[PDB]
A paper describes a structure:
The crystal structure of PE566 has four copies of the closed form (αLβ).(αSβ) complex in the asymmetric unit. The structure of PE566 is most like that of PE545 (RMSD 0.23 Å over Cα 266 atoms), with near identity between the β subunits (167/178 residues) and significant identity in the α subunits (sequence identity: αL—48/78 residues; and αS—39/70 residues). In contrast to the two previous examples, the spectral difference between PE566 and PE545 is primarily due to different chromophores. In contrast, the α19 chromophore of PE566 is bilin 618 and two sites on the β subunit, β50/61 and β158, have bilin 584 chromophores, while the β82 chromophore is PEB, as per PE545 (Note: the PE566 β subunit has an additional residue at the N‐terminus, hence the bilins are actually attached to Cys51, Cys62, Cys83, and Cys159, however, we keep the conventional bilin nomenclature to facilitate comparison between proteins). We note that the presence of a double bond between the two central carbon atoms in the propionate side chains of pyrrole ring C in bilin 618 and bilin 584 is the only chemical feature that distinguishes these chromophores from DBV and PEB, respectively. Comparing the structures of PE566 and PE545 shows only a few distinguishing features. One notable difference is in the loop between helices hG and hH which differs in the β subunit attached to αL in the two structures. This loop interacts with pyrrole ring D in the β50/61 chromophore of its neighboring β subunit with the aliphatic portion of Lys151 making van der Waals contact with the face of pyrrole ring D. In contrast, this surface is solvent exposed in PE545. Despite having no sequence similarity and being one residue longer, the structure of the chromophore loop (residues Thr19 to Ile34) in PE566 αL is nearly identical to that of PE545 with PE566 His22 and Glu26 forming a salt bridge that supports the central pyrrole rings of the α19 chromophore (vs. Arg21 and Glu25 in PE545) and the side chain of Glu26 making a hydrogen bond to the nitrogen in pyrrole ring D, as seen in PE545.
In addition to their membrane‐bound chlorophyll a/c light‐harvesting antenna, the cryptophyte algae have evolved a unique phycobiliprotein antenna system located in the thylakoid lumen. The basic unit of this antenna consists of two copies of an αβ protomer where the α and β subunits scaffold different combinations of a limited number of linear tetrapyrrole chromophores. While the β subunit is highly conserved, encoded by a single plastid gene, the nuclear‐encoded α subunits have evolved diversified multigene families. By careful examination of three newly determined crystal structures in comparison with three previously obtained, we show how the α subunit amino acid sequences control chromophore conformations and hence spectral properties even when the chromophores are identical.
Author numbering:
A (entry chain C): 15 to 178
B (entry chain D): 1 to 70
C (entry chain B): 1 to 78
D (entry chain A): 2 to 8, 15 to 178
The structure:
């Protein structure tokens, strides 16, 4: 539960190990600094396209179910952000995805709806990484982050495949 | 396999170049880079993810008003 | 003068044209035989509240000082 | 204009009552769309305004800043939401009577005695104003509500004026 901190010389070394270190940390930053919005928008969009999810028979009906769903969206988003920080999907697959479809099948968490929630979070993340807004609307130097965008997109695709 | 604990890695990114925090930077316990990396830091912590009833009610109330329509 | 109760009007707009899946039992007044029967404005006075735990989550997002979405000029500093 | 919900319990206006309500406020249909585009984005508006206030003045969450501690940040996030919602009801009713009487009157005196910084509150309100105007004209990055194409600049100007009343009251 204790937090790890990577600054100074350790951070210098880290950015020598992962590719495009500086841009990669900006990419992570742009996602985690907007985490609650990404998760809520994806769950809200999942539902607005399928209102039966919040009908009395839907899997997001009641505050208890909605909170568990928003929680799961954040868990998944955060494991994806750690995959981007790390540069591979090993922890994402082992600590989050492996066994998750089986979990959702036993709970009856709808796969068609999770598929859409994941694809929206993916759309959010790609837009923040490959942000084509003007320089004046960016907190980072304008440049080409398309490779990082494609990488994070791949991590979401691994989520989709695992629980599809 | 997932442990069903509800935990996930919470990452905080501190690009605090130029910052005068008013207090010491004591969280990072390693050695200094002798450069701008001494003003930046990454925090990673595995934490239980928790969503309040207020948040869940807020998402519902802002979703029910935008449901697809004819 | 406001009463310090932290109560505020919560508006919920239900433009639910075509939504026969939900029976419109909340509004009890007369109908019109028009799309106005398929829409509804809800207003309620609610005590607005933010938990300390939820505020901690927002702090974790903000403390990068780069917590901004697509819109808006970047006016922040460090 | 009409303060129609001044009366615990929720009020529901549909069917005949709604048909009448839209005649009592100007541009009834457009107005309800405008209100909806704001309220349906309320969490993002408040978060963006408080975050923007902070990123422009990082010391607000330093140990000497007014948003320091979870308790204070919670109170600020709450107040941002309270103010946005009273503004949204001014736009629903078409005037500022409730906004002034039930939110703004006495509010500056309260913030003065608490030491809530007025220059920072001004920026939060200013950002929320910029958000609301863009949502009314559907020029925000997110455009999740569909409307018939038309000119809502009058409504955008109206809601901007309500935010200006907030700024003048607590400035
Ligand atoms: C169509 C959008 C839809 C599908 C498809 C589906 O599966 N569920 C759908 C809608 C839905 N409605 C509610 C609850 C409320 N709906 C209204 C507006 C409705 N009620 C009226 O009296 C009139 C006009 C005369 C209309 C247009 C209201 C006021 C609701 C409740 C408010 C409250 O304070 O509780 C839901 C939530 C679950 C439910 O069916 O009760 C859904 C998912
Ligand atoms: C500059 C942006 C700034 C001004 C101006 C101001 O008034 N406060 C400012 C920054 C600030 N920092 C924190 C807390 C943390 N800062 C860091 C990074 C720092 N710590 C290190 O060990 C290193 C070494 C390379 C660096 C660059 C971290 C990790 C912080 C806390 C992590 C945690 O788990 O909480 C704050 C919060 C209040 C405080 O000063 O403690 C501010 C406001
Ligand atoms: C895509 C990700 C976006 C983008 C990013 C971008 N960043 C660039 C340079 C850069 N970023 C940082 C901060 C970063 N480094 C850290 O250590 C941490 C925090 C711990 C973060 C956050 C730094 C320090 C730098 C540059 C340092 C230097 O001396 O040059 C660049 C420029 C290219 C590059 O340096 O690799 C880009 C580009 N730009 C975009 O347009 C998108 C939105
Ligand atoms: C500015 C706000 C944007 C704009 C709005 C716009 N809406 C129009 C017509 C319209 N809107 C509604 C939904 C509204 N009515 C309700 O009762 C409720 C919910 C209870 C809502 C929400 C309706 C039903 C209609 C049309 C009704 C009809 O019978 O014609 C129009 C067209 C002009 C007008 O009708 O006044 C506009 C314009 N359009 C934009 O482009 C901006 C972004
Ligand atoms: C119901 C009518 C419904 C919605 C709810 C909404 C859901 C939705 N959102 C997207 C795409 C993006 N959402 C983003 C979120 C943010 N942008 C910001 O500035 C703040 C910080 C964040 C919270 C609002 C982003 C960055 C997105 C990428 C750009 C884009 O708009 O595409 C989508 C897209 C799905 C897809 O591309 O397949 C949906 C469905 N939309 C609704 O209809
Ligand atoms: C700290 C790094 C910081 C910020 C946070 C941000 C503050 C800020 N925001 C604006 C303008 C708008 N913000 C909007 C919010 C949303 N748009 C969406 O699509 C989602 C759902 C909403 C929540 C994020 C909107 C609609 C804005 C209007 C359009 C625009 O691009 O401006 C501003 C602008 C002030 C001005 O115009 O003078 C600021 C300062 N900026 C930061 O640096
Ligand atoms: C939102 C996009 C979904 C949806 C999600 C729900 N999940 C529910 C219970 C649940 N979720 C998990 C997996 C979660 N826990 C972990 O430890 C990890 C990874 C490390 C993850 C991704 C578990 C183990 C459980 C059961 C125990 C618990 O609640 O913590 C849930 C409530 C289930 C019920 O009440 O029967 C929901 C609603 N629901 C949707 O409709 C969309 C697709
Ligand atoms: C956020 C943009 C601000 C900021 C806000 C803070 N307000 C604090 C306490 C507080 N706020 C109110 C007014 C609020 N209550 C109502 O009933 C109404 C209208 C109906 C509103 C607008 C009151 C009455 C109070 C005191 C009682 C209470 O907390 O509920 C506060 C904590 C003050 C302290 O304990 O020292 C904060 C931080 N702070 C900022 O830095 C930005 C500019």
């Amino acid at each position: 539960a204790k937090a790890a901190y990577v600054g100074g010389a350790d951070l210098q070394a880290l950015k020598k190990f992962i590719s495009e270190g500086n841009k990669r940390l900006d990419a992570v930053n742009s996602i985690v600094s907007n985490a609650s919005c990404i998760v809520s928008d994806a769950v809200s969009g999942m539902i607005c396209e399928n209102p039966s999810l919040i009908s009395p028979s839907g899997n997001c009906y009641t505050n208890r179910r909605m909170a568990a769903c928003l929680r799961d969206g954040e868990i998944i988003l955060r494991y994806v952000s750690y995959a981007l920080l790390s540069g591979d999907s090993s922890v994402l697959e082992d600590r989050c995805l492996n066994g998750l479809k089986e979990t959702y099948s036993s709970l009856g968490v709808p796969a068609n709806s999770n598929a859409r929630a994941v694809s929206i979070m993916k759309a959010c993340a790609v837009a923040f990484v490959n942000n084509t807004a003007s320089q004046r609307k960016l907190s980072t130097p304008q440049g080409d982050c398309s490779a990082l965008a494609s990488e994070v997109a791949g991590y979401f695709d691994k989520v989709s495949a695992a629980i599809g | 396999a997932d442990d069903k604990s509800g935990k996930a890695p919470v990452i905080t990114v501190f690009d605090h170049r130029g910052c005068q925090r008013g207090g010491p930077d004591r969280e990072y316990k390693g050695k200094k880079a002798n450069g701008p990396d001494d003003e930046m830091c990454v925090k990673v912590q595995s934490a239980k993810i928790a969503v309040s009833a207020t948040t869940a009610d807020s998402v519902l109330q802002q979703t029910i008003s935008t449901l697809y329509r004819k | 003068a406001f009463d310090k109760s932290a109560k505020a009007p919560v508006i919920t707009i239900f433009d639910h044209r075509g939504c026969t899946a939900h029976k419109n039992a909340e509004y009890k007044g007369a109908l019109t035989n028009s799309i106005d029967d398929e829409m509804c404005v809800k207003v309620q006075s609610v005590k607005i509240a933010v938990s300390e735990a939820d505020a901690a989550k927002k702090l974790q997002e903000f403390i990068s000082y780069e917590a901004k979405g697509i819109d808006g000029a970047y006016t922040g500093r460090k």
